[PDB]
Amino acid sequence: LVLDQLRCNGVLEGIRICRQGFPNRVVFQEFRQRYEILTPNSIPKGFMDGKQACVLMIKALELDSNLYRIGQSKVFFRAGVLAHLEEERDLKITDVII
Amino acid sequence: SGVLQLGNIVFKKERNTDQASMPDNTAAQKVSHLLGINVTDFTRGILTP
Amino acid sequence: SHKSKKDQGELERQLLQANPILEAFGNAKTVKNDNSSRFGKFIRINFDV
Amino acid sequence: CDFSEEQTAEFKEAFQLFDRTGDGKILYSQCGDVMRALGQNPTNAEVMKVLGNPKSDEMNLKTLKFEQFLPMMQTIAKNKDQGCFEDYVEGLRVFDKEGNGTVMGAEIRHVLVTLGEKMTEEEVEQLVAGHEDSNGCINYEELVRMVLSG
Ligand SMILES: [Mg+2]
Q1: CB neighbour list of residue D55: distance below 8 Å, 6 or more residues apart
Q2: Cα–Cα distance, D149 to B4 (Å, whole number)
Q3: 3-class SS at A79?
Q4: Which residues of D touch C (CB under 8 A)?
Q5: What contacts A97, CB < 8 A, 6 or more positions away?
Q6: Could you count the other beta carbons within 10 Å of the beta carbon of residue A27?
Q7: Which residues on chain D are in Cβ contact (under 8 Å) with A97?
Q8: Where in the cell is it found (chain C)?
């Protein structure tokens, strides 16, 4: 009963695309306004395009090429990549609070 | 200055569907900083009212 | 809990009681369940900015 | 020396202000309190590392003299890592909901009592100089500026 309920519901098919695909998606502007404390010394103080700014932050973060894929208007991430950045962001914000 | 900066946003036509796209949002960021508003909200409202 | 000034309101408190009413009016024992829902509901809790 | 010895008279005269005997000796807790009051805003890690004692579990036991305080300040004035105002401004704005930075004072109290070093509510009640009314909003600009002025 439990096996037939999981196969028809598509639980397995829903997790495979989550691993092989990029479930996380962050906008260029939203990615910079939320992940700037990780690489502060990586973007000039002056104004710059949102796409050009995210390219420098990802390069400074030392992220693997297979863990992300820049698109036309949204930055894609694999399962477990964006979650790791959230943990590192908390440590940075925690230090700022301290 | 904000009114002057308005219009520089070179909207591009998507190859798949007919939808506006802002590949270079520098002018949008400048207009938002001048008028004193957000950039993400302005972009979402201009491209998806 | 995020308002303080108006903590514990009549709306948030009545939201928990408005469901048991609709449930007891058409829910009971069945062959494969003891408390089945004989009607489909779609609650939409609105939120401000 | 990284500090003018002629100015040590001011520090020596200031050390004799607490409600204690002041017989040339001060406990570790007293040293920390003096560093927090007069000296630049330190941190528990800095107090425990800079001529401190991580193994120490009772600060009311260790004791130091007056001359033992000048090396601590001279070292903290070179090893400290104090951030600018933009970092704190961004950290406070991260908790913003309207975008203008005028969130109710409850948010600041919660962030100061829970996140970070979890301060006491009685201590923050004296610093929170905001107005309590229908809105109760408090700005981060003037508040954080007066807090970081020192
Ligand atoms: Mg049911």
Answers
A1: none
A2: 39
A3: coil
A4: 98, 104, 106, 134, 136
A5: D91, D111, D115, D116
A6: 17
A7: 91, 111, 115-116
A8: Cytoplasm, Cytoskeleton; Cytoplasm, Cell cortex; Cytoplasmic vesicle, Secretory vesicle, Cortical granule; Cell membrane
